[PDB]
Scaffold this active site. Structure first.
Site, PDB file in Angstrom:
ATOM      1  N   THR A  54      43.130   5.349  42.547  1.00 60.00           N
ATOM      2  CA  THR A  54      43.140   4.813  43.943  1.00 60.00           C
ATOM      3  C   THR A  54      43.116   3.298  44.019  1.00 60.00           C
ATOM      4  O   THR A  54      42.488   2.639  43.200  1.00 60.00           O
ATOM      5  CB  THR A  54      41.916   5.417  44.673  1.00 60.00           C
ATOM      6  OG1 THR A  54      42.080   6.847  44.611  1.00 60.00           O
ATOM      7  CG2 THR A  54      41.757   5.046  46.170  1.00 60.00           C
TER       8      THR A  54
HETATM    9  C1  LIG Z   1      42.926   6.820  42.288  1.00 62.90           C
HETATM   10  C2  LIG Z   1      44.286   7.575  42.391  1.00 62.90           C
HETATM   11  C3  LIG Z   1      42.525   6.963  40.790  1.00 62.90           C
HETATM   12  O1  LIG Z   1      41.285   6.271  40.542  1.00 62.90           O
HETATM   13  C4  LIG Z   1      41.862   7.420  43.299  1.00 62.90           C
HETATM   14  O2  LIG Z   1      40.517   7.110  42.875  1.00 62.90           O
HETATM   15  C5  LIG Z   1      41.875   8.966  43.540  1.00 62.90           C
HETATM   16  C6  LIG Z   1      40.832   9.332  44.631  1.00 62.90           C
HETATM   17  C7  LIG Z   1      41.318  10.316  45.727  1.00 62.90           C
HETATM   18  C8  LIG Z   1      42.195  11.383  45.394  1.00 62.90           C
HETATM   19  C9  LIG Z   1      42.515  12.361  46.350  1.00 62.90           C
HETATM   20  C10 LIG Z   1      41.987  12.271  47.637  1.00 62.90           C
HETATM   21  C11 LIG Z   1      41.129  11.200  47.976  1.00 62.90           C
HETATM   22  C12 LIG Z   1      40.849  10.198  47.030  1.00 62.90           C
HETATM   23  N1  LIG Z   1      41.486   9.671  42.319  1.00 62.90           N
HETATM   24  C13 LIG Z   1      42.156  10.755  41.848  1.00 62.90           C
HETATM   25  O3  LIG Z   1      43.296  11.051  42.199  1.00 62.90           O
HETATM   26  C14 LIG Z   1      41.412  11.623  40.845  1.00 62.90           C
HETATM   27  C15 LIG Z   1      41.254  10.888  39.477  1.00 62.90           C
HETATM   28  C16 LIG Z   1      39.954  11.296  38.783  1.00 62.90           C
HETATM   29  C17 LIG Z   1      39.902  12.431  37.959  1.00 62.90           C
HETATM   30  C18 LIG Z   1      38.673  12.854  37.423  1.00 62.90           C
HETATM   31  C19 LIG Z   1      37.498  12.104  37.659  1.00 62.90           C
HETATM   32  O4  LIG Z   1      36.295  12.500  37.058  1.00 62.90           O
HETATM   33  C20 LIG Z   1      35.430  13.384  37.798  1.00 62.90           C
HETATM   34  C21 LIG Z   1      37.552  10.960  38.459  1.00 62.90           C
HETATM   35  C22 LIG Z   1      38.786  10.534  38.994  1.00 62.90           C
HETATM   36  N2  LIG Z   1      42.121  12.881  40.598  1.00 62.90           N
HETATM   37  C23 LIG Z   1      41.604  14.099  40.892  1.00 62.90           C
HETATM   38  O5  LIG Z   1      40.468  14.267  41.312  1.00 62.90           O
HETATM   39  C24 LIG Z   1      42.488  15.299  40.617  1.00 62.90           C
HETATM   40  C25 LIG Z   1      42.955  15.977  41.933  1.00 62.90           C
HETATM   41  N3  LIG Z   1      41.800  16.284  39.773  1.00 62.90           N
HETATM   42  C26 LIG Z   1      41.756  16.197  38.420  1.00 62.90           C
HETATM   43  O6  LIG Z   1      42.154  15.233  37.780  1.00 62.90           O
HETATM   44  C27 LIG Z   1      41.106  17.327  37.659  1.00 62.90           C
HETATM   45  N4  LIG Z   1      40.075  16.831  36.708  1.00 62.90           N
HETATM   46  C28 LIG Z   1      38.688  16.873  37.260  1.00 62.90           C
HETATM   47  C29 LIG Z   1      37.674  16.268  36.251  1.00 62.90           C
HETATM   48  O7  LIG Z   1      37.824  16.884  34.952  1.00 62.90           O
HETATM   49  C30 LIG Z   1      39.154  16.777  34.397  1.00 62.90           C
HETATM   50  C31 LIG Z   1      40.193  17.431  35.349  1.00 62.90           C
END
Ligand SMILES: *[C@@](C)(CO)[C@](*)(O)[C@H](Cc1ccccc1)NC(=O)[C@H](Cc1ccc(OC)cc1)NC(=O)[C@H](C)NC(=O)CN1CCOCC1
Ligand SMILES: *[C@@](C)(CO)[C@](*)(O)[C@H](Cc1ccccc1)NC(=O)[C@H](Cc1ccc(OC)cc1)NC(=O)[C@H](C)NC(=O)CN1CCOCC1
Lengths: 248, 238, 220, 231, 202, 244, 243, 233
Positions: free
Chosen positions: E1
């Site tokens: 993000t």
């Molecule tokens: C930017 C893109 C990356 O830092 C944003 O922070 C974004 C936040 C956001 C996303 C959707 C709606 C509102 C706000 N972050 C992500 O897109 C996020 C990246 C991330 C993954 C894991 C984390 O550790 C807990 C922290 C950040 N992506 C996700 O949440 C996606 C949908 N899910 C996964 O990656 C699945 N993961 C969960 C944790 O274990 C590994 C698999």
């Protein structure tokens, strides 16, 4: 709080338990339910109270419950309380089978439920189960067996007993005809029809009004069978021929 | 007559009899006196012999280095409540390393003694205490009842025939403050004297004294320790 | 797996392959991946198969309980919330990747729900190990407010791309079309893969296996 | 501040009768009359829904409720108690479906519901339900009609009536019931059994009726009730 | 993000990118990271998609009940306090970088930062997310005391465009929201609309 | 109000005419206790309580019926003092929980609602008895102004301009209806509160009494404080002078 | 036999020989202890609630004296009965409504909120440890699917939808007024509905209200937000009734 | 019918008062505290010659330096005696010293009013203990004798009697007891007073005698030991 408490697990000044005794009065209103032990098998015979014209008849039985592959029981008292206890009996029987990989012996199954029924008389402050049960079964320890349960939690083995409506009058009628060691399931059924015909308020006695089940041993395995409509009709009219023969 | 079985039953007069009957236990207990000056707080207690061949029953108990109590009513309820007071004091010194202020302890009793007076199948604490203490605000004399109500006192007496002890403390209350430790105790046991029937008076057997103040920590004087205070027996007139 | 969903003019199209795998071997050539939630909402599932089945059945059960109490047709948001809050509570240990789609009193709604409990609301979603291949087709060929037959073709092509490109995906293409007045659960929508005919005979004849013991038990 | 009594409120009398259960049976007897008829082709449940004021909305609350896609319920007695038994039965039906992936048999549901009814006759600090239930169903290619009373006892019926004037209702049924009547005729006699114990003349918004067959259980629409009501 | 919130006179301006990543794959190229909590209160979500979402949904429930019970339009500080409590108690379990921004009739426009630790601080402007790293220099050089609403919209859009340009885990579309007494107004920037700072090399 | 073959023994039991006598008997407890009043002025709230001394042996300040619930909230009680103190503790804890969750001083109307819900909870069961205590709550803010609430044993909560609870509550309310509190400064109110108490006090039937006074307003910077000895003693001088 | 009693059937919620629950019946008479009457009328595109507002003296702050309560942004209610019981039921209603939206993602129907409260009220009618709540709730709101709704739930646990209702002392006399008015086929506009509500409460008490003597709460299709009228707007309707 | 924690209008607990009445039905017991030790005497009161007198134990040792005599509902004392035994051994384990006679008495006295109905544990006491106890022991403060009753009140006694005939026994002790008598005189005096109040004739089987002294541990008197003191008519 203590104002609304009726103290069901309390002692009488006489040294007795009122709620148990009052529960015993309830059994005397339920259908006449008897069982007798024979040499070749064992049977249960009960008066049916579900005799209304508009009833459907969905189940194999009314008051005869199957508990185990080698055991069956009949009930006298409050029907709903019976459904609780009989379901529990099935559970107890299965726990034993899970643990020892053998069928539960007749006494062990009876005593297990009886310990539950006793508990309700001593602690908890709740009403006792208003049910008396008759147990028929087979095990590799004592063979064909017949048992009796009380709301008190008391149990006993019998060669022939009756519970429910006109319990007293049926027992003395059993004492008259029962012959220990020489009883066969052939004559056992004949005795069963004989007692029910006299003890029941209906003097005609149709197959609709009685329910008979037999527990037998066929080539290794145990057979529990609830008698069909015409099979009961045949036993009843045979008794009439012995009733009309009493012109001697 | 049908409202006096539980604490949870209000009477049509707006009273709770079970709390009121519990207060009777304080009256049935042996009389005790508590008074304070500007520097010292003194508890004087009259001990009872169950059948004068057994020792005179204990009356004054330790709570902390700066707090001590005098009991009236049920002994077993007194010990139960004293353990609570001891515990809260130990808790304060563990956490804050400072003595628990008397007033704050007394108000903790007011909350603990309330809880049972409002739940079914519970009973009030059948004991009245006279708390003597010393802190940053000086000497203290406090009174607790079976009703969770507590009082801040110039001087107080509770127990059997404590009315006569109360009227003496009424008369001499204007002299307590500027007066010294030796005179305070004299005033204390002179009030306790008034409770006794005209035949029997104070002895080394039946008097217990608890003192806490500026210079000294809470100390209990019982048998031979009580005689320096009795030496100076002004004798009883009526 | 390959599972995909699309929002078209009249409602929703959902797609799925039929391959289940244990290790790197195909366990089931024809398994149902599009699951019933309510008469108006269906849900595609990917990842841990058993998790897929039980999560999709529990929520379906809970919605029926809900819709019986309300007397109303259940909403896709309720299906979304129920699935989301569960999958989150289990910290992603229930391995269910979901494509949720249905038609409400509000209209046509499509969701993608992740094992960890994160949801997205989009006109087209793909989940599973063949998602990239399926998502590529959507990015290239998807248009807004397309016809039912056109959307059926699109989703099937997306699933096909997952089948012919992802080793975890294969066999038949399943479809589920949901609109305001109609529901088509097209089980074998397309059979693009078939076993080659055995033109060699290996039928083991009677008496070619040696027996040691035999017991015959008669029945009713 | 809340607790809960542990002692039974239903006890055995000196004559051996559970007084509270019989008093609850007096509660259902004073309730709105309802009728159920098995038709070896379907089941019909019909109940008096006499409103009072017309200010009341007829479509807002139901006496005939679906437990699942193949089972239905009607009551006599206390509305609020019945509704508790409806939510409890719906849960029991769902518990079964989650485990066996198969619609709960009607007999199996009634047993599980009757057990709950049994509990409130022995459990601490509670009164029994002032409701008798009429449960209908279709499973294994067969129609089912059951009754579950305050005690927790259950009975299989071909045709029965409960609530106000249930004695006359049953005598009316045994003279009129044929063990070979089709659903259309069964619905007709069901309304006729209600007619016997009504007073005030019937509209389609005056009574409630539900049917159960191979297609499932559903509530009959006011338009359909009106069509049958042309007596 | 990348996420951003700027406070002006009559309210606040919020901005976020639209990229959701699952490793190096964009799972959602058009994400609404600006989540409404109440009428005038919004939050910007960065970190774990499932974690931030769950917290947001719990604060919405908690603030909803609180507002009705108190019978007041909810304080932005109060909504930020509900985020703090959750982000602090479960700091070891969550990965959430939240910016709470909104309006209330008592204190006006407010911007609160709740980083991963669970601390809370009010700021004139706040930035968060992985992409916010590349725009600390620009944001410090550009920010001016007392910017108008229209300038704050330009300021957030510029900062985000630069961040999406460099950061891999940021990109797609700029989503902007303006909140003042009159209400909430939303706009979206697509392709050409994103402020172009041309590729600057030989 | 009569029938008591049951009905009046438990708070979980209604009377045939639909009354909970246990709550009504709990209200009788506050009716027997001495009178307490509070008046909402233009810039704050003033409390006044007639504290009856049972013995001259009690220190001046004992059995204080005025309480500090929060740094901005005051509490005046009437009835059973044991219940009063425990209700103050509940109010204290409710006020601190709000600060710990939301970061600011609890609004009085919310604190009054929360505490009243607790009071009400003791009127529904046989396991517990209702509180034999009525209490008033006062607070002043620059954003909310002067606010005064009263909660009775039933759990009912209302806002007041002037309120009286205790032995001569009806006698006191007739004296407060004579005042124009909406236009009055809380410096003038103290004088008037003291007067009402002295009038209402029974000289012959009840013994001597101590007057307790507290206030919260503009004059006290929003903090609930005990009225200073020099101002209290001025009002007592004035209240005795009113007895011409 | 009528009026018969056995054991403690008039003290706890256990059956009488007739099959009645006297404690619940006594809870209905507890509603009339407030001495107030509430009326609710449903219109073509609105729902109106009206109640008595009896402020006896100058000393009471009249803004705090109310029986109108907001549960959700779109659902309001009128409480009739014991005041402290009423408040409790409102706080529970507020809780269940917020919990519903959080679990299911959409706002609770008036239909469903009334049911939930009536289900909760049932627990008190079967358990002996606590008394039923001596109060009555009438909910109003615009259903986003069905339109204006008026629902009411009893201390007995009965609940129902209504074209119009009443609660309190003059309940049975004002439902009789509403019967006559509903049988007459009017054009149920906002003006008609508000005025029918007021005149019902006016003729059933024989008062002719001042704007400070009644409180009115409305919900419209044009504005689903639950709204309390204020004295200025109530008086506008009162001056219009001079015809 | 009321709860077990109900106060009488006089300020006493009914159940506690009635528990004291139960002692008046128990067999009488005498304890005498002297400078040379503490002796405890109690009547066994045998109802049948078939009953073994050696199985009726009303005097039991808690530790080597503490003995206890009991009167009333003997069955109730089982827990009180056991709790006293556990307390003494817990103290040794923690502090490597023996508990004082007062400390043990106080520990047991804490259990007296630990009864109730509502707000109770899965096994809390439903009623008071229907026994009175006499703790005779020796510690640093010399030899002491303590008396506990159902109310919880414990007190040091020079000489105390508890039981059905504690009326005449207490007044008889106030005649014979001198605060400087020997232990031999104490044993002699107690047995004399015991036979004055017993229904059955006193011999070496129907009574029990124990002594604790600064010199030696708790000693239970055997038949022969008793014969030596019984012989004085
Ligand atoms: C930017 C893109 C990356 O830092 C944003 O922070 C974004 C936040 C956001 C996303 C959707 C709606 C509102 C706000 N972050 C992500 O897109 C996020 C990246 C991330 C993954 C894991 C984390 O550790 C807990 C922290 C950040 N992506 C996700 O949440 C996606 C949908 N899910 C996964 O990656 C699945 N993961 C969960 C944790 O274990 C590994 C698999
Ligand atoms: C495609 C085929 C994966 O490449 C789909 O996601 C598919 C989903 C599906 C299939 C059938 C019915 C409903 C839905 N997934 C599978 O087929 C799945 C693959 C998988 C194996 C192991 C995993 O590690 C946690 C995750 C996914 N296959 C299975 O579930 C097989 C039949 N069972 C197992 O491998 C047993 N596992 C389960 C998890 O715990 C370790 C043992």
């Amino acid at each position: 709080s203590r104002r609304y408490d009726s103290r069901t697990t309390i002692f009488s000044p006489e040294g007795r338990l009122y709620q148990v005794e009052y529960a015993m009065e309830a059994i005397g209103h339920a259908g006449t339910c008897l069982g007798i032990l024979a040499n070749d098998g064992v049977l249960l015979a009960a008066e049916r109270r579900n005799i209304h014209k508009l009833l459907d008849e969905v189940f194999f039985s009314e008051k005869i419950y199957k508990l185990n592959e080698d055991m069956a029981c009949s009930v006298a008292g409050i029907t709903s309380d019976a459904n609780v206890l009989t379901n529990e009996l099935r559970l107890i029987a299965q726990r034993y089978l899970l643990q020892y990989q053998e069928p539960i012996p007749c006494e062990q199954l009876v005593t297990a439920l009886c310990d539950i029924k006793q508990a309700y008389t001593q602690f908890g402050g709740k009403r006792p189960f208003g049910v008396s049960l008759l147990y028929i079964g087979w095990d590799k320890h004592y063979g064909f067996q017949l048992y009796q349960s009380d709301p008190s939690g008391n149990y006993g083995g019998w060669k022939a007993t009756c519970i429910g409506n006109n319990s007293a009058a049926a027992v003395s009628m059993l004492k008259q005809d029962y012959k220990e060691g020489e009883m066969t399931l052939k004559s056992a059924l004949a005795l069963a029809v004989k007692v029910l015909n006299k003890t029941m308020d209906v003097s005609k006695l149709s197959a609709e009004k009685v329910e008979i089940a037999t527990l037998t041993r066929e080539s290794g395995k145990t057979v529990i069978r609830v008698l069909k409509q015409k099979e009961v009709e045949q036993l009843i009219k045979k008794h009439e021929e012995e009733e009309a023969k009493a012109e001697r | 007559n049908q409202y006096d079985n539980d604490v949870t039953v209000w009477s049509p007069q707006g009273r709770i009899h079970q709390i009121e009957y519990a207060m009777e236990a304080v009256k049935q207990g042996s009389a005790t006196v508590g008074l304070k000056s500007k520097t010292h707080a003194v508890l004087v207690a009259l001990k009872r012999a169950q059948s004068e061949l057994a020792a005179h029953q204990k009356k004054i108990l330790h709570v902390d280095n700066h707090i001590g109590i005098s009991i009236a009513g049920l002994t077993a309820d007194a010990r139960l409540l004293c353990n609570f007071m001891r515990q809260e004091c130990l808790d304060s010194r563990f956490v804050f390393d400072r003595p628990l202020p008397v007033s704050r302890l007394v108000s903790l009793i007011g909350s603990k003694t309330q809880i049972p007076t409002q739940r079914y199948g519970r009973r009030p604490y059948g004991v009245g205490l006279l708390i003597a203490g010393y802190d940053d605000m000086g000497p203290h004399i406090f009174q607790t009842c079976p009703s969770a109500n507590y009082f801040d006192c110039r001087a107080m007496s509770i127990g059997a025939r404590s009315q006569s002890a109360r009227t003496y403390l009424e008369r001499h209350m204007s002299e307590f403050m500027e007066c010294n430790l030796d005179e305070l105790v004299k005033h204390g046991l002179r009030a306790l004297r008034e409770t006794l029937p005209a035949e029997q008076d104070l002895t080394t057997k039946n008097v217990s004294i608890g003192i806490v103040g500026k210079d000294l920590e809470f100390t209990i004087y019982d048998d031979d320790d009580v005689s320096p205070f009795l030496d100076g027996l002004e004798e009883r007139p009526q | 797996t390959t599972i995909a969903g699309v929002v078209y003019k009249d409602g929703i199209v959902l797609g799925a392959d039929t391959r289940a795998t244990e290790g790197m071997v195909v366990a089931d050539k024809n398994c149902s991946k599009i699951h019933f939630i309510s008469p108006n909402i269906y849900c595609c599932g990917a990842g841990t198969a058993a998790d897929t089945d039980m999560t999709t059945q529990l929520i379906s059960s809970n919605l029926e309980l809900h819709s019986l109490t309300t007397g109303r047709l259940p909403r896709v948001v309720t299906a979304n919330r129920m699935l989301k809050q569960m999958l989150f509570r289990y910290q992603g240990y229930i391995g269910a990747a979901l494509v949720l789609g249905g038609v409400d009193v509000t209209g046509p709604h499509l969701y993608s729900i992740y094992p960890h409990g994160s949801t997205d609301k989009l006109p087209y979603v793909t989940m599973g190990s063949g998602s990239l291949a399926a998502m590529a087709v959507f990015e290239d060929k998807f248009r807004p407010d397309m016809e039912e037959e056109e959307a059926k073709k699109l989703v099937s092509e997306a699933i096909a791309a997952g089948i012919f490109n992802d080793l975890g995906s294969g066999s038949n293409i399943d479809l589920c079309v949901i609109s305001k007045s109609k529901l088509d659960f097209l089980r074998p929508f397309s059979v693009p893969n078939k076993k080659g005919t055995r033109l060699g005979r290996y039928r083991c004849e009677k008496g070619t296996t040696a027996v040691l013991t035999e017991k015959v038990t008669p029945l009713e | 501040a809340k607790r809960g009594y542990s002692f039974s409120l239903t006890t055995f009398s000196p004559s051996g009768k559970l007084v509270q259960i019989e008093y609850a049976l007096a509660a259902v007897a004073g309730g709105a009359p309802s009728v159920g008829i098995k038709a070896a082709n379907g089941v019909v449940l019909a109940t008096e829904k006499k409103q009072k004021s017309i200010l009341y909305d007829e479509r807002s609350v139901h006496k005939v409720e679906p437990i699942t896609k193949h089972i239905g319920l009607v009551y006599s007695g206390m509305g609020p108690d019945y509704r508790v038994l409806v939510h409890r039965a719906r849960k029991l039906a769902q518990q079964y479906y989650l485990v066996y992936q198969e619609p709960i048999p009607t007999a199996q549901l009634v047993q599980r519901v009757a057990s709950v009814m049994q509990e409130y006759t022995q459990s601490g600090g509670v009164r029994p339900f002032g409701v008798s239930l009429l449960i209908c169903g279709w499973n294994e290619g067969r129609p089912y009609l059951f009754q579950s009373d305050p005690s927790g006892a259950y009975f299989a019926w071909k045709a029965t009536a409960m609530g106000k004037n249930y004695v006359n209702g049953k005598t009316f049924l045994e003279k009129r019931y044929n063990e070979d009547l089709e659903l259309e005729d069964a619905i007709h006699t069901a309304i006729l059994t209600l007619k016997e114990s009504f007073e005030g003349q019937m509209t389609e918004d005056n009574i409630e009726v539900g049917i159960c067959n191979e297609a499932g259980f559903r509530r009959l629409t006011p338009t359909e009730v009106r069509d049958y009501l042309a007596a | 993000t990348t996420i951003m919130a700027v406070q002006f006179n009559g309210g606040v301006v919020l901005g976020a990118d639209s990229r959701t990543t699952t490793g190096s794959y964009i799972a959602n190229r058009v994400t609404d990271k600006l989540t409404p909590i109440h009428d005038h209160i919004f939050c910007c979500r960065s970190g774990s998609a499932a974690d931030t979402q769950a917290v947001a949904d719990a604060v919405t429930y908690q603030l909803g009940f609180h507002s009705i019970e108190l019978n007041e339009p909810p304080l932005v500080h109060t909504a930020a306090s509900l985020f703090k409590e959750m982000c602090y108690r479960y700091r070891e379990d969550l990965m959430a970088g939240i910016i709470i921004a909104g309006w209330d009739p008592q204190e006006g426009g407010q911007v609160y930062s709740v980083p991963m630790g669970g601390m809370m601080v009010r700021q004139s402007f706040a930035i968060g997310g992985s992409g916010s790293s590349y725009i600390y220099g620009y944001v410090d050089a550009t920010y001016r005391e007392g910017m108008t609403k229209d300038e704050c919209l330009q300021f957030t859009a510029n900062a985000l465009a630069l961040a999406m340009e460099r950061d891999g885990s940021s990109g797609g579309v700029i989503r902007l929201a303006a909140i003042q007494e009159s209400g909430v107004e939303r706009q979206v920037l697509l392709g050409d609309q994103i402020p172009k700072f041309t590729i600057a090399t030989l | 109000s009569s029938i008591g073959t049951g009905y009046d023994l438990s708070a979980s039991t209604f009377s045939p005419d639909g009354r909970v006598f246990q709550v009504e008997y709990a209200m009788k407890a506050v009716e027997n206790s001495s009178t307490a009043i509070g008046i909402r002025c233009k810039d704050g709230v003033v409390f006044g309580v007639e504290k009856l001394v049972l013995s001259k042996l009690y220190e001046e300040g004992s059995n204080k019926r005025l309480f500090n619930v929060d740094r901005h909230v005051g509490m005046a009680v009437a009835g059973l003092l044991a219940d009063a103190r425990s209700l103050a503790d509940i109010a204290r804890e409710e006020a601190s929980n709000f600060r710990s969750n939301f970061g600011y001083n609890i609004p009085l109307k919310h604190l009054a609602d929360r505490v009243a819900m607790y009071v009400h909870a003791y009127t529904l069961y046989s396991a517990v008895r209702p509180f034999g205590c009525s209490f008033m709550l006062g607070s002043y803010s620059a954003n909310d102004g002067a606010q005064l609430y009263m909660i009775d044993p039933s759990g009912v909560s209302y806002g007041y301009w002037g309120c009286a609870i205790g032995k001569a509550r009806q006698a006191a309310k007739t004296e407060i209806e004579k005042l124009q509190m909406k236009e009055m400064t809380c410096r003038d109110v103290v004088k008037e509160v003291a007067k009402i108490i002295y009038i209402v006090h029974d000289e012959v039937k009840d013994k001597a009494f101590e007057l307790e006074l507290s206030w919260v307003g503009e004059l006290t910077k929003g903090r609930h404080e005990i009225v200073p000895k020099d101002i209290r003693e001025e009002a007592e001088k004035y209240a005795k002078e009113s007895l011409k | 036999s009528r009026g018969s009693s056995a054991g403690f059937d008039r003290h706890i919620t256990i059956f009488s020989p007739e099959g009645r629950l006297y404690q619940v019946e006594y809870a209905f008479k507890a509603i009339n202890q407030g001495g107030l009457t509430s009326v609710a009328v449903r219109g073509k595109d609105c729902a109106v609630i009206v109640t008595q507002k009896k402020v006896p003296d100058k000393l009471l702050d009249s803004s705090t004296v109310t029986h109108l309560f907001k549960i959700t942004e779109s659902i309001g209610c009128v409480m009739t009965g014991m005041t402290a019981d009423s408040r409790s039921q409102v706080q529970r209603a507020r809780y269940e409504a917020a919990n519903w939206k959080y679990k299911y993602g959409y706002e609770i129907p008036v239909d469903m909120l009334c049911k939930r409260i009536a289900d909760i009220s049932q627990v008190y009618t079967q358990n002996a440890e606590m008394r039923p709540l001596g109060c009555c709730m009438i909910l109003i709101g615009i259903d986003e699917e069905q339109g204006p709704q008026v629902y009411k739930c009893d201390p007995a646990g009965y609940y129902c939808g209504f074209k119009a209702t009443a609660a309190g002392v003059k309940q049975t006399e004002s439902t009789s007024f509403l019967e006559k008015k509903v049988k007459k086929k009017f054009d149920w506009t906002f003006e008609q509905t508000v005025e029918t509500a007021i005149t019902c409460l006016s003729t059933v008490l024989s008062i002719d209200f001042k704007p400070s003597e009644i409180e009115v709460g409305v919900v419209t299709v044009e504005n689903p937000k639950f709204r309390i009228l204020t004295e200025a707007e109530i008086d506008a309707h009162l001056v219009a009734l001079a015809e | 019918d009321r709860g077990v924690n109900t106060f009488s209008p006089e300020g006493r607990l009914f159940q506690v008062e009635y528990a004291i009445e139960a002692i008046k039905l128990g067999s009488t017991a005498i304890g005498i505290q002297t400078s040379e030790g503490v002796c405890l005497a109690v009547e066994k009161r045998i109802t049948s010659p078939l009953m073994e007198p050696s199985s009726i134990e009303k005097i039991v040792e808690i530790d080597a330096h503490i003995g206890c005599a009991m009167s009333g509902l003997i069955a109730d004392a089982k827990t009180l005696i056991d709790k006293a035994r556990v307390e003494t051994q817990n103290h040794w384990f923690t502090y490597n010293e023996t508990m004082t006679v007062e400390s043990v008495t106080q520990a047991v006295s804490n259990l007296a009013l630990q009864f109730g109905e509502e707000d109770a544990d899965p096994g809390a006491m439903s009623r008071p203990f229907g026994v009175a106890l006499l703790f005779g022991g020796v510690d640093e403060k010399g030899p002491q004798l303590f008396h506990m009753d159902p109310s919880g009140t414990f007190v040091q006694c020079d000489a105390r009697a508890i039981g059905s005939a504690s009326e005449g026994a207490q007044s008889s002790l106030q005649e014979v007891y001198h605060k400087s008598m020997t232990l031999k005189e104490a044993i002699k005096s107690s047995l004399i007073i015991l036979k004055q109040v017993m229904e059955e004739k006193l011999n070496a089987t129907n009574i029990e005698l124990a002594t604790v002294q600064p010199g030696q541990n708790f000693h239970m008197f055997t038949k022969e030991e008793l014969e030596e003191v019984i012989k004085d008519i």
